[PDB]
């Protein structure tokens, strides 16, 4: 997989691919790697699909219970920490999970990276999965805080495309999300096959590829 997420002036962008593999065999062409924990919280998935789905859906249970007890939405910081503590219980037991908890709370937009080791990091921009290096290349050179919602959505979309192209274990389609203070907003499923040719023509990029 390839996932990314970054904070900016108008909230946070979240973009993921949709490929699933079992060795060199592509098991799925379209798998959802985002979880809608609540209208203001998202979680990305990378690593063991089973581990990602189970523990993030368990996080949602625990985040939902927080709202009922306190009559108030959980913070992104607190949600990320609950998840990291779960990972710390099964320390060295072989879990494989890499996720970014993205949302908007009182402190503004929030983004935390969490993995199976228990690592929990706050940051402006993150990318996980086999194709994260390719995505970082596009992100680092084109990222600004002063980005427009339109340009930011494109950047995350274009960054996944770069990874889907080069990384054999990333591809299928792109799922886009935009988190605002009124909640997250889905910006569709985009087939890489069609998107690649479109970007190539409009942008002029991927000159080496013939089409």
């Amino acid at each position: 997989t390839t996932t990314l997420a970054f904070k900016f002036q108008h909230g946070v962008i979240v973009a993921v691919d949709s490929r699933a593999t079992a060795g060199s065999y592509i098991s799925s062409l379209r798998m959802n790697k985002v979880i809608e924990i609540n209208p203001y919280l998202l979680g990305t998935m990378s690593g063991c699909a089973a581990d990602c789905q189970y523990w993030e859906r368990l996080l949602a249970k625990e985040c939902r219970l927080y709202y009922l007890r306190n009559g108030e939405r959980i913070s992104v910081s607190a949600a990320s920490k609950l998840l990291s503590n779960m990972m710390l219980q099964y320390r060295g037991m072989g879990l494989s999970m890499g996720s970014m908890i993205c949302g908007w709370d009182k402190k503004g937009p929030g983004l935390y990276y969490v993995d199976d080791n228990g690592t929990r990091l706050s940051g402006q921009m993150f990318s996980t999965g086999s194709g994260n290096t390719y995505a970082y290349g596009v992100l680092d050179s084109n990222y600004k805080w002063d980005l427009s919602v339109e340009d930011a959505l494109y950047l995350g979309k274009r960054s996944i495309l770069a990874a889907a192209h080069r990384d054999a274990y990333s591809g299928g389609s792109v799922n886009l999300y935009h988190v605002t203070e009124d909640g997250w907003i889905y910006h569709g499923n985009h087939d890489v096959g069609e998107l690649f040719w479109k970007v190539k023509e409009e942008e002029g990029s991927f000159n080496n590829v013939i089409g």
């Binding site: 990972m87 710390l88 320390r91 993995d115 690592t119 940051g123 990318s127 970082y136």
Partner: protein
Amino acid sequence: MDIILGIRVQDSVILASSKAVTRGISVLKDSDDKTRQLSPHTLMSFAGEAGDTVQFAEYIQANIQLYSIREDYELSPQAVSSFVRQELAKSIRSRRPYQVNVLIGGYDKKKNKPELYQIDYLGTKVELPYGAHGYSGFYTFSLLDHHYRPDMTTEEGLDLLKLCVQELEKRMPMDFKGVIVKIVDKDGIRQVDDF
């Protein structure tokens, strides 16, 4: 994580800790603060296996903060360092030991003295004028052995620390993305924002 340095001067303790966090072949973060304030005049930096470091540090932080509230009194750096050592010595014979190395920099308000303690994951404690963990000492201790005096000012301590980081940046194969420097003195803990 990798590099954590410590130096005890005349009236303060200075801790320098790298900013890099790596996962796979990618540097995920270049501004990570590898330290926790245990009490107003005691700072602990840490380095070791991923996840274990922060969990251990926060666990120690919680225990010292609990003690502070219970007694309405700040434990001496020496007392804190002994508590930390015991937890690590207890840990090493556990089913799954915590692989964390720490430096504890504190200013003892009773004795009016800065104090630096170096503790490794086995529970090996030593009080030192300057210390480090892992490979950091291999590059830096020769400079410290040469330049260090016990009557150094905080400014002179920072200059000698810059020289240690410059040597690390030259001779290490590892890019640790610079260091966050923090000073511990009679007035408490503060961060040097320009280094």
